[model samples]
Target: GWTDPTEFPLGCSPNVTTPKNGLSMELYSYDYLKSGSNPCWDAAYLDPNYPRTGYKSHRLLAKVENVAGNINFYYHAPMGCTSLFDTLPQAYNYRTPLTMTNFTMLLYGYFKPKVTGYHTFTISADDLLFVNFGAGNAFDCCKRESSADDFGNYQAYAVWGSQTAKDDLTVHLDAGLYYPIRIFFNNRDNDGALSLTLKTESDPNPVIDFSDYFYSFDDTKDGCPGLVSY
Candidate 1:
């Protein structure tokens, strides 16, 4: 029974609480009023204090359940326009018009594996995609915030319509403990998509049954939203 302090810095810690299902999703747009200043994959937009004065930004609170197999989605000109609304129910319900253009999508939550050891996480996304686990800063993009970070982190880039981008990382974790997981993906224009996979050495198959493995924390007693609030 062990936990990393950096992973749970501040008021965030394990305790009895209501476990919500699925990972929380937030979508941010750069077009700010059809003419906003920031560009795609810019981590500055994620800063809670980032100024949003000039352009209009659309935000989504869609949550995804059952992240087994591979979280894969791709867009093509032949298929016409495929917005986040088409793929995510929350986006549709909230009326998120376009996920096709300058936009950033954030997928974050807590996960606890039933069996623990060395696990591999794979990612492939267009434009830019970043993954940070174990309660690290969710706004970190481009590279690891520091060298002390674990090996389970990832940063990759691919041009629009090209599917050649690929990167993977591995990390060791224990069973029955929750670890914060955060992913940031940005698409420029035209075709874009994001894919993620997880596997362990003991078993080659990607773990399914997310309700048993993934959870969203309540902000009340959690105390430290900075650690696991999202």
Candidate 2:
């Protein structure tokens, strides 16, 4: 039987009020970098439990700059999968540092409902330590977030990474919400370092910005990545 999609009644809206003390501010962080000694590709270095595997899968770091007016995020991946490289167009060259010829980058943004504010955004990639793999070999891999996965689903608007890996920038956006937002980075050959920065303008930037929360690898005496709130 074909059932009609559920619909919300006219003027119906979910409760959008803050808690008693107001929104309890908190930050969550996760490390996408895998630590170990692996030149280009190391299966042992890969986090199999991560639910995805491949020579093109490597660690990446993102820096958020200017959260208020079009934030700029950057990322980089090391080279090892030659097959991943071949798919790229000649105009797209990943042979050099930060120059990703065959990889595509995707970023997603989320927000909370009560937090009615606006924001603009931008992105960039660094060109350094770009590697090369031999010809006629495609790195067998799995997609990070497939259609079947709940987390993989995203809003209507999203953007892809630009060429040269270095100095690549994106357009601006205006957004506001109470829920946490996310930015994802997908690379062709995962073997290099990635860096990203985010900035905000709604309020005076705090010494520790809530919008740029990320888990640190350094072990804290508490046995957990330090958490911050502003």
Instruction: Give stretches of model 1 more than 4 Å off.
Output: 1-13, 32-70, 79-85, 89-97, 137-164, 208-211, 220-230
Q: Write the per-residue lDDT of candidate 2 for residues 36-121, one digit (tens) a residue.
A: 43333222222322222332243342222222222232333334333222222121111223324223232222222222233222
For model 2 the local lDDT of residue 135 reads 9
Clashes within 3 Å, all models in order: 4, 33
Kindly list the per-residue Cα lDDT of model 1 for residues 157-200, writing each as its tens digit: 23334564677656666665566666667665546677666788
Candidate 1 — which pairs collide? 32-55, 32-56, 33-55, 33-56
Alpha carbon lDDT at 41, candidate 1: 38
Worst lDDT window (10 residues) for model 2? 132-141
Which candidate number would show the highest TM-score if scored against the true structure? 1
Weakest 10 consecutive residues, lDDT, candidate 1? Answer: 139-148
